[PDB]
Design a protein around this ligand. Structure first.
Ligand SMILES: C[C@@H]1CCN(C(=O)CC#N)C[C@@H]1N(C)c1ncnc2[nH]ccc12
Length: 288
């Protein structure tokens, strides 16, 4: 699947981001040279990269080729880049950008946040239905299309789960979004994405305020006196049962659900399938 965009019609406008070994850029695709052309977000493999990076990139392209859902960024096509000697990944451009760039500048109410949470779970259930783990679920990878719509917008760490396994075995790791089993056993379950969702939910309820972020909060608890032992120390504080605190005006019951996504024991966490009904009921509740 499907379309081939010719780089001769692609006009670079703007850098939108930088993720793993890729950059996402805004282009205008203008065959008729008119300005009528469509704006598209284009992900490319970085200005230098080795065999590990490249084998990953091919996997990312194939995963995003086969995903199709209301709350997953729309895959539009590829672009030969000869170049870097690989393809560029072309997707729809969502101009409001990530929740991480958006929420710190726009006072969004509780009901809308829970709606986004519901929607993130929907996309994640679908993704788990298709047998993938995301491994990088955080507010910076959730795109606000409008208002009443979010999409999961990046798959750079996503992996298929081996058809006869419960997990995938794994640096650039977003460790402050990771469950203990990922930091310790280096295994990544479906339940491990639910932990990350709990942190993303915490991010939303704090409007992604930089001072309240997980790295900031966790490094305040851990201290920076021994950088060598950050992961070790994070794992111990988590296994001790210490958690990220309640965000201001977070309803008691929502922090409860948050904590339940943070069960130390993975099997005690809800699936994304479990969360969809709970979230949409709590969403409904908070409008009226
Ligand atoms: C949040 C989106 C996913 C992560 N982004 C990266 O740059 C990852 C890498 N490398 C940016 C992207 N983003 C700001 C976007 N912004 C606007 N439209 C977009 N369409 C698709 C992505 C996108």
């Amino acid at each position: 699947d499907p379309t081939v965009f010719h780089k001769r019609y692609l006009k670079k406008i703007r850098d939108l981001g930088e993720g793993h070994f890729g950059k996402v850029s805004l282009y205008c695709y203008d065959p008729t040279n008119d300005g009528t052309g469509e704006m598209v977000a284009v992900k490319a493999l970085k200005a230098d990269a080795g065999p590990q990076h490249r084998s990953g990139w091919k996997q990312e392209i194939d995963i995003l080729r086969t995903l199709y859902h209301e709350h997953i960024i729309k895959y539009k096509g590829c672009c030969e880049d000869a170049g870097a000697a690989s393809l560029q990944l072309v997707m729809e451009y969502v101009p409001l950008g990530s929740l991480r760039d958006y929420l710190p500048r726009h006072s969004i109410g509780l009901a809308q946040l829970l709606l986004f949470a519901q929607q993130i779970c929907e996309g994640m259930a679908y993704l788990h239905a298709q047998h993938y783990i995301h491994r990088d679920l955080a507010a910076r990878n959730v795109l606000l299309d409008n208002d009443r719509l979010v999409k999961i917008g990046d798959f750079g760490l996503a992996k298929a789960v081996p058809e006869g396994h419960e997990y995938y075995r794994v640096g650039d790791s977003p460790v402050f979004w990771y469950a203990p089993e990922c930091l310790k056993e280096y295994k990544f379950y479906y339940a491990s994405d639910v932990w990350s969702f709990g942190v993303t939910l915490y991010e939303l309820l704090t409007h992604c305020d930089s001072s309240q972020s997980p790295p900031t909060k966790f490094l305040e608890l851990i201290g920076i006196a021994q950088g060598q032992m950050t992961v070790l120390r994070l794992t111990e504080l988590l296994e001790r049962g210490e958690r990220l605190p309640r965000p201001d005006k977070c309803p008691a019951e929502v922090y409860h659900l948050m904590k339940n996504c943070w069960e130390t024991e993975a099997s005690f966490r809800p699936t994304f399938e479990n969360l969809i009904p709970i979230l949409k009921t709590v969403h409904e509740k908070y409008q009226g």
